[PDB]
């Protein structure tokens, strides 16, 4: 009736959310990143902004957040606020008018093995180059470049959870149909930081417009 409180107290007595959660500083933090697209909220062509409801699942092993279940009556998982732990600073590079990083700090699920799963919701208003040529029968290829802003590839490595975005919970939109989706990991060198390439995961979605409304009302 009090073992979970004891566990939470023991874990965070001298925990530091600033340092990376690795045993040795020369190690690389392996983060698994899975974008779950819940709803394609809007595709504003005139502003070239795509607004999407997402859950940004991030999974990583925190070396210092292990515990032995037998010490706590078999507790194998706990829920803790994300503000207390170290987190990857995933930033949407192509943000248009939203937030760059996650602002809804939901609770993370911590397991006895140290595995943390964090599934924060976000409303990404990303930039997308709207091709107007074949409008209103156009196919748009809109992308989300997500990556650790300050940690470079030799320090924190992000890997995609699967080759494709998670569309299992995707609410079907009435104007655009996701014909294709795919995620590619890239390493690129910026002029700020010539000695350290930075990793990113570019999710992309080939969405086809449903032209019936525009056929009736315009064509």
């Amino acid at each position: 009736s009090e073992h979970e409180t004891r566990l939470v107290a023991k874990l965070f007595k001298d925990y530091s959310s600033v340092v990376r959660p690795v045993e040795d500083h020369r190690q690389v933090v392996e983060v698994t990143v899975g974008l779950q697209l819940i709803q394609l909220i809007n595709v504003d062509e005139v502003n070239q902004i795509v607004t999407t409801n997402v859950r940004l699942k991030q999974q990583w092993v925190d070396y210092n957040l292990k515990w032995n279940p037998d010490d706590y009556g078999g507790v194998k998982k706990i829920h803790i606020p994300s503000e207390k732990i170290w987190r990857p600073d995933l930033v949407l590079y192509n943000n248009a008018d939203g937030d760059f990083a996650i602002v809804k700090f939901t609770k993370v699920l911590l397991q006895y093995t140290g595995h943390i799963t964090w599934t924060p919701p976000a409303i990404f208003k990303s930039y997308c180059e709207i091709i107007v040529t074949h409008f209103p029968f156009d196919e748009q290829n809109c992308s989300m470049k997500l990556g650790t802003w300050t940690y470079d590839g030799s320090v924190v490595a992000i890997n995609p959870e699967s080759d494709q975005p998670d569309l299992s919970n995707f609410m079907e939109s009435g104007e655009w149909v996701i014909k294709e989706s795919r995620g590619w990991k890239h390493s690129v060198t910026y002029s700020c930081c010539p000695d350290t390439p930075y990793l990113d995961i570019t999710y992309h979605f080939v969405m086809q417009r449903l032209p019936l409304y525009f056929i009736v009302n315009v064509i």
Partner: antibody
Amino acid sequence: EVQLQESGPGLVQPSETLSLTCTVSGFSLTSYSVSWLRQPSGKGPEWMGRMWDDGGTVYNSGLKSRLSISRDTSKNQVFLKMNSLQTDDTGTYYCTRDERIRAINWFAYWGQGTLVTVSS
Amino acid sequence: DIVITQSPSLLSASVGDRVTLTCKGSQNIDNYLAWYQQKLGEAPKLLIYKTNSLQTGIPSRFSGSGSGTDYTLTISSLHSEDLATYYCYQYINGYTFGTGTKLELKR
């Protein structure tokens, strides 16, 4: 410096209750956890339970119903009480001071151990 | 929980010899293995924790190594004080102890 001393009856009747007292010296129970282990005759040691520094307790799932652990921080004593004793409880009982790194615990110091034999 | 086995069950070696006791688990122990020395009638003494961290006051001749599911305890030069039983145990998932390796001087 750090020392732990188990004491208790050398022979206990079956179905009676065993009581063991681990006296502590060299450290304060308010800052170090004290675990109880037992080594059955002809078997490897097994973990029985822990009295936490914060005064809480935790027990082995197989022995949770049969075990109680308490402490007296004024006397620096840890008490183990076990009921429904059986022949299989015959073995050497140790109390250990536990070290910690964050939430992970391991047995850092052992007591000398008390032999308990359960026979009618 | 992670079952642990030790080898050899009984080992004979002469004074000064290097000895390497082996401890193998049924699952990845993730270096959360400790070694302690128990003598007949004496309180067990911890030798090594986290597979290589030497306990304060332990002679430097004791060293630990291992990874995954296989670990070893090495005595570079066996002294007469070191004839005892050595137990490996694991504290990452429950608490499990090896059967123990009894070390005797060769005759």
